[PDB]
Design a protein around this ligand. Structure first.
Ligand SMILES: CCCCCCCCCCCCCCCCCC(=O)OC[C@H](COP(=O)(O)OCCN)OC(=O)CCCCCCCCCCCCCCCCC
Ligand code: SF4
Ligand code: SF4
Ligand code: SF4
Lengths: 209, 74, 90, 176, 96, 303, 70, 156, 171
């Protein structure tokens, strides 16, 4: 929940100030008054929809400072869960965009998919969402036997379900006519204003970390 | 040329142009006028017998007057 | 007065519903105004148009066809005029 | 390597532009969307009947905070304070006293279930595996006093069952 | 293929034991898929394991009345199951 | 016997609306992967009975309004329109055989526009006034179009009597001599009943809710009557009652099913859409339905 | 599945079935097996008024069939 | 006592009517909002229990305080709580809300939410896995089943 | 529920015209004009009564007081009875009941007329075969013979459209 103060000529604008800081929690000072391994879940849950790439970034920060390369099986498992987290966060971005725009049901279809992904997180770490699970210095407590077949079956079924989402929306005329005309991003402004990620992938210049 | 930009406009102008022009060419508007004329709302009032009229038959079975026979043949 | 009886029954039963629902628990913009008078003038021309199915039964049909097309064509001229002169845009 | 979207042009063949204009005038892919949604209407719904069919879980769920004890024996804990040191919420509070037997023991062992973020660090930090993240997650507490557990609430929570927790630990003592 | 599902839909009703007994489990909450009867249980209650349904409708409990003396015909609770059936019921295993 | 007819017509509308709430919640539930409401009793019927009686129990927010008498006067008007407005619609033999009833339908819809405006004025401060003012504008935007399409679809039927309509739709349904006119009419009925894809984003919410869903059932009954209907045999009219109720049910399900799967429109996109897409095309269909029966030599036998 | 939405649809359809059957039954019941005569135009009204006048009982549905020719 | 019999049966009826639907408002600041959405998911229904997610605080039956409550937020939270109809009930969901939680020893975090509103049902977990929240809502419904409101109105 | 019902509806019509001739807030004025138009519709439907009162019901009570309340919403506020409005309402009701009493218990009260004081069932047709409810085919004749009239009517309304857009800042 954000506060927004917009000063507007009517059904239009003049200015718009997003007042934010409402969800402030003292995270940096609290990490300053703890150790590394104790204060890992702060970086697990400061960003909360993505849940393992944040851990991967903090683990790579501590590993890059500490000069320790993880073993390669931990690296490939970390790649797998980074792609699971990427899939989950992009599909939640799509569905909360759709639910805030209207468009009731594909939200629920893809949250059935995300319920299966939380089942995968349960079988791997044990908790529902906030798998700590990525220690700096390699991944802790590897996955139990009888998981890769489940991931493979999910991969096939989710390929079919994302094709059926593209069937549902995406060349729908009035959702297109809702969002085509609005929100251009100049590449000069895309580099000055410090946009990142999907903004850089969409607004022209080719850039992937 | 214009069929890609504003197609509902062009469809509306086409059906409007045929709704204006199309009532000219007709073998049917004469039938429209005959059927619409031949419906008696009011009473058919009779007339005084003899101004020496060798027409206008007295029994309504007599076909001397103009009957209607294009009705039952559609 | 029999549909007045139906009207009275509907009104009294609705007031019973409202009184049980209440006594048992105890600047502007210019662009809004264009739509108003636009509705008003086009609804007046609809008021002209709507007795047309009363009129189809007469012995003078060509003039009625011509002037009915003239009325709807004038309504189209008014709509196309405000369309071309940026009347309802944003 | 890249694969970018939306680089074409609308065609100039009359058939393609009249197919697009037919989509415009005739509400076609809207009806195809209705067909897709009815195709998901005629599936069977994947709802679980909750109080009779409970949800699937893992062997290593992190729940109840129940202590354990020895086979036909006494309390498993030591008051060695490793769980209190590793506890990131600092919800563990331990006061120790030794008893007449000579072996070291406790007096007070409080978990702030309000503060507990349910990590697993106290599960993985106990050298004798005394404190265990329990199996079930059904707390649902009216007052605010009852979410502050004593040692006796934890031991009654670990003596209402251990065979569950023993089955889980005997299932997965090899990973951790 | 029309009367057969209507014929099979009677088979869990007349197979249940009667009409008011079917009405009791219908008015309890929902379940009409009776017929496997895997595990009876001390403090009364029963456990039904089926394989013909999807993952999530394998195993369901049906509670009995007065298991504490509290008239639990209505208002059934969680944690009314003993813990070995709590290992079995949450699909942490395949052995009853 | 006349007040008995009145009671048998206006008592079951409450049962109709509450069971419509369970019907649309279960239909949206099976459009999703949901069951429910099915835990509360057999398949959730006393659950709409229960939440209706709960919302009558639940204590109102104290006003905090202005002109309390006007706050009384608006929802009483909405619900008395929803009560009075099933009269000439023929379930086989209608309640009052009128010379003209469809202009009465459109005028009562305009009175519903009045009720929405009065609730929006008497409710609260400025932002509720602006939102309800835009809602009144997007409700009033369509009594041009729907009345125009009504005029075009019964120009092929001569009289306003609606029993000549239930006669002259015996051979083929009137969906076939006007499919685009009827489709634009159904879009305008979605606009009159004001559901998704047409946006919205107080008290009594029960009565607001009641007037809206009775308006929905009314517009779908008038949809079924206006466009189709099978043959009426006297001295057995239960056949026509059954077939009428079945097709009105199917079209109400299709109505909610069109609500179920589309995003809401932007407001200026909605006005742009209505004017610059429907209104020249409705005029063109009017003038072609004027020029057609003089070319088929078939003006309707206007009694 | 949708086998259990059909009880709700069926009950709401029965709640929509009652005014049609009740209205047609009361129209066939209020004139002794006849139908309620309609009067859109004054010709039918004068015909109905002389019909209710000649029957003697001051009710139009009886309608004095052929037993008073001479 | 036929009057006491009538008052007991009518109190049972109206308390059943109260516990029937209980449509909430989803307040939902942080990741507990995502978990409320995931008990709004197609697997765990809410409509089976009469519960409907809804952004209307003018008619909401219960209020689910979920997420980390801060000082910049708490006047707005209680101002939402004050324009709520007077039969009102509160579910505190999540470690952050039911006693401060992980950001406890910190400025600009209200230590719990008893410092703002009264709390009826605490449901802990971080996030409380949706089965636990649903059992908490069942215990809230049984709290509504035990009210004896009209009996106290009789013998008052 | 008696014979003088057109007279009674006329009295409620004058009640409404006094009720918003007392100069209230304009939303109360619009409410009073809707009440007056509804009972005037009742009067003209009681004189038989086919089309014209159901026609005014769509226009004034369908699309004119809507625009009046719309303009009351967008332009004025009237943010918060008075002795002037209540005094004018009492004097109007006084004039009403004074005229009604002095007509009902006499022959006539005249501004300059001769008002025969009794119920207006007189005058009416003697049950003739009208067969089309005369006003219906009357306004149906508005298109066959109405050559000049609808031409200047439509031209006046088209000019009204261009007038409104010019005054509200053409183009
Ligand atoms: C309302 C309405 O329009 O009622 C119409 C009704 C007369 O019916 P109508 O279709 O005009 O046919 C002519 C004779 N039946 O009109 C009437 O029956 C007149 C009723 C007048 C009394 C009630 C006035 C309420 C205002
Ligand atoms: S780590 Fe284990 S033995 Fe040590 S104090 Fe904690 S529970 Fe006791
Ligand atoms: S799970 Fe974490 S917060 Fe909870 S007691 Fe253990 S270490 Fe502390
Ligand atoms: S209690 Fe846990 S899951 Fe909930 S808001 Fe706090 S960090 Fe997120």
């Amino acid at each position: 929940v954000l506060r927004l103060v917009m000063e507007l000529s009517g059904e239009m604008v003049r200015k718009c100030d997003p007042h934010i800081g409402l969800l402030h929690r003292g995270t940096e000072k609290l990490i300053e008054y703890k150790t590394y391994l104790q204060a890992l879940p702060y970086f697990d849950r400061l960003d909360y929809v993505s849940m393992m790439c944040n851990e991967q970034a903090y683990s790579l920060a501590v590993e890059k400072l500490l000069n320790i390369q993880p073993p390669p099986r931990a690296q490939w498992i970390r790649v797998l869960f980074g792609e699971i987290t990427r899939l989950l966060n992009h599909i939640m971005a799509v569905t909360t965009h759709a639910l805030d725009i209207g468009a009731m049901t594909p939200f629920f279809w893809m949250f059935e998919e995300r319920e299966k992904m939380f089942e995968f997180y349960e079988r791997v770490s044990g908790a529902r969402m906030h798998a700590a699970y990525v220690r700096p210095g390699g991944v802790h407590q590897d996955l139990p036997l009888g998981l890769m077949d489940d991931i493979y079956e999910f991969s096939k079924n989710f390929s079919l379900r994302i094709d059926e989402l593209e069937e549902m929306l995406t060349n729908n005329r009035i959702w297109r006519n809702r969002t085509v005309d609005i929100g251009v991003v100049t590449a000069e402004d895309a580099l000055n204003y410090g946009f990142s990620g999907v903004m850089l992938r969409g607004s022209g210049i080719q850039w992937d970390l | 040329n214009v069929w890609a930009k504003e197609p509902v406009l062009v469809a509306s102008f086409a059906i409007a142009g045929l709704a204006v022009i199309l009532p000219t060419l007709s073998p049917y508007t004469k039938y429209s006028l005959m059927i619409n004329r031949a419906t008696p709302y009011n009473y058919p009032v009779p007339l005084r017998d003899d101004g020496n009229m060798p027409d206008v038959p007295s029994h309504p079975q007599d076909p001397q007057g103009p009957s209607l026979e294009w009705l039952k043949r559609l | 007065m029999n549909l007045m009886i139906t009207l009275l029954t509907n009104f009294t039963l609705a007031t019973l519903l409202v009184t049980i629902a209440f006594w048992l628990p105890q600047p502007f913009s210019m662009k809004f105004f264009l739509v108003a008078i636009t509705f008003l003038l086009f609804d007046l021309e609809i008021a002209l148009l709507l007795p047309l199915p009363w009129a189809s039964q007469t012995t003078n049909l060509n003039t009625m066809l011509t002037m009915a097309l003239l009325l709807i064509f004038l309504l189209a001229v008014s709509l196309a005029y405000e369309w071309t002169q940026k009347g309802l845009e944003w | 390597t890249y694969k970018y979207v939306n680089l074409r042009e609308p065609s100039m063949d009359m058939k393609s532009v009249t197919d697009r204009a037919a989509q415009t005038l005739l509400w076609t892919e809207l009806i195809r969307g209705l067909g897709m949604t009815l195709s998901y209407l005629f599936r069977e719904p994947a709802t679980i009947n909750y109080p009779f069919e409970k949800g699937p879980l893992s062997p290593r769920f992190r729940g109840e905070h129940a202590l354990r004890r020895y086979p036909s024996g006494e309390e498993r804990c030591i008051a060695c304070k490793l769980c209190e040191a590793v506890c990131p919420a600092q919800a563990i509070t331990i006061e120790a006293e030794p008893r007449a037997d000579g072996s070291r023991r406790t007096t007070r062992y409080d978990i702030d279930m309000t503060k507990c973020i349910y990590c697993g660090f106290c599960q993985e930090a106990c050298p004798v595996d005394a404190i265990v993240e329990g199996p079930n997650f059904e707390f649902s507490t009216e007052t605010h006093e009852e979410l502050l557990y004593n040692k006796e609430k934890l031991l009654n929570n670990g003596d209402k069952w251990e065979a569950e927790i023993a089955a889980n630990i005997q299932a997965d003592y090899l990973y951790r | 293929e029309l009367l057969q599902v209507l014929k099979r839909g009677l088979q869990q009703v007349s197979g249940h034991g009667g009409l008011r007994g079917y009405l009791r489990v219908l008015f309890r909450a929902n379940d009409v898929r009776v017929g496997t009867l895997v595990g009876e249980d001390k403090y009364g209650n029963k456990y039904y394991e089926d394989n013909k349904q999807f993952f999530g409708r394998h195993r369901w409990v049906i509670y009995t009345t007065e298991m504490n003396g509290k008239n639990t015909f209505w208002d059934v609770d969680g944690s009314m199951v003993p813990p070995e059936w709590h290992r079995w019921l949450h699909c942490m295993t395949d052995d009853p | 016997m006349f007040m008995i007819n009145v009671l048998t017509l206006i008592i079951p509308i409450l049962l109709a609306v509450a069971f419509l709430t369970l019907v649309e919640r279960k239909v949206l539930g099976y459009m999703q992967f949901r069951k429910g409401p099915n835990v509360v009793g057999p398949y959730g019927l006393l659950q709409p009975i229960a939440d209706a009686i709960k919302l009558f129990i639940k204590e109102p927010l104290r006003p905090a309004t202005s002109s309390i008498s006007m706050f009384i006067l608006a929802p009483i008007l909405a619900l008395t329109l929803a009560l009075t407005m099933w009269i000439p619609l023929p379930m086989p033999y209608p309640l009052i055989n009128m010379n003209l009833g469809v202009l009465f339908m459109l005028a009562m819809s305009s009175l519903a526009v009045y009720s929405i405006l009065w609730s929006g004025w008497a409710s609260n401060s400025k932002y509720a006034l602006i939102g309800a003012l835009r809602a009144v504008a997007q409700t009033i935007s369509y009594e041009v179009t729907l009345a125009i399409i009504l005029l075009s679809v019964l120009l092929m039927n001569g009289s306003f009597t609606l029993s000549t309509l239930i006669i002259t739709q015996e051979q083929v349904w009137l969906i076939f001599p006007a499919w685009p006119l009827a489709m634009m009419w159904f879009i305008s009925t979605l606009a009159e009943t004001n559901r998704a894809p047409f946006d919205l984003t107080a008290g009594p919410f029960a009565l607001f809710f009641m007037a809206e869903y009775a308006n929905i059932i009314m517009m779908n009954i008038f949809t079924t009557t206006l466009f189709l209907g099978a043959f009426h045999n006297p001295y057995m009219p239960e056949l026509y009652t059954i077939n009428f109720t079945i097709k009105s049910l199917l079209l109400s399900i299709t109505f909610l099913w069109i609500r179920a799967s589309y995003p809401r429109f932007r407001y200026d996109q909605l006005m742009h859409l209505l004017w610059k897409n429907f209104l020249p095309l409705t005029l063109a269909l009017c003038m072609w339905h004027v020029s057609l029966p003089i070319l088929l030599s078939s003006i309707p036998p206007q009694t | 599945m949708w086998f259990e939405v059909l009880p709700g649809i069926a009950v709401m359809g029965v709640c929509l079935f009652i005014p049609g059957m009740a209205t047609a039954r009361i129209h066939r019941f209020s004139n002794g097996g006849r139908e309620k005569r309609v009067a859109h135009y004054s010709y039918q009204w004068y015909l109905m008024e002389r019909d209710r006048r000649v029957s003697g009982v001051n009710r139009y549905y009886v309608s004095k069939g052929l037993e008073n020719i001479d | 006592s036929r009057g006491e019999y009538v008052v007991a049966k009518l109190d049972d009826l109206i308390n059943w009517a109260r516990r029937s639907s209980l449509w909430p408002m989803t307040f939902g600041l942080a990741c507990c909002a995502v978990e409320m959405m995931h008990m709004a998911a197609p697997r765990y229904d809410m409509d089976r229990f009469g519960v409907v997610f809804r952004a209307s605080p003018r008619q909401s039956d219960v209020m689910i305080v979920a997420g980390t409550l801060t000082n910049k937020m708490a006047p707005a939270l209680r101002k939402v709580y004050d324009q709520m109809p007077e039969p009102r009930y509160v579910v505190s969901m999540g470690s952050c809300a039911n006693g401060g939680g992980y950001y406890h020893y910190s400025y600009s975090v209200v230590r719990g939410c008893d410092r703002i509103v009264p709390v009826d049902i605490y449901v802990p977990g971080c996030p409380p896995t949706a089965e636990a929240l649903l059992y908490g809502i069942l215990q809230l419904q049984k709290k509504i089943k035990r009210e004896k409101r009209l009996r106290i109105w009789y013998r008052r | 529920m008696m014979t003088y019902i057109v007279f009674i509806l006329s009295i409620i019509f004058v009640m409404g015209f006094v009720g918003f001739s007392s100069k209230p807030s304009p939303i109360y004025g619009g409410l009073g004009l809707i009440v007056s138009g509804g009972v005037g519709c009742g009067i003209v439907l009681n004189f038989g009564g086919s089309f014209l009162g159901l026609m005014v019901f769509l226009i004034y009570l369908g699309g004119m007081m809507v625009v009046f309340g719309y303009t009351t919403a967008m332009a004025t506020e009237q943010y918060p009875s008075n002795k002037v409005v209540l005094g004018t309402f009492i004097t109007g009701l006084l004039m009403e009941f004074l005229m009604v009493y002095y007509v009902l218990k006499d022959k006539e009260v005249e501004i300059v007329f001769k008002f025969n004081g009794m119920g207006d069932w007189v005058i009416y047709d003697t049950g003739d075969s009208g067969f089309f409810s005369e006003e219906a085919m009357g306004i149906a004749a508005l298109y066959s013979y109405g050559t000049w009239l609808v031409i200047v009517t439509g031209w006046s309304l088209l000019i009204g459209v261009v007038v409104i857009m010019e005054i509200t800042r053409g183009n």
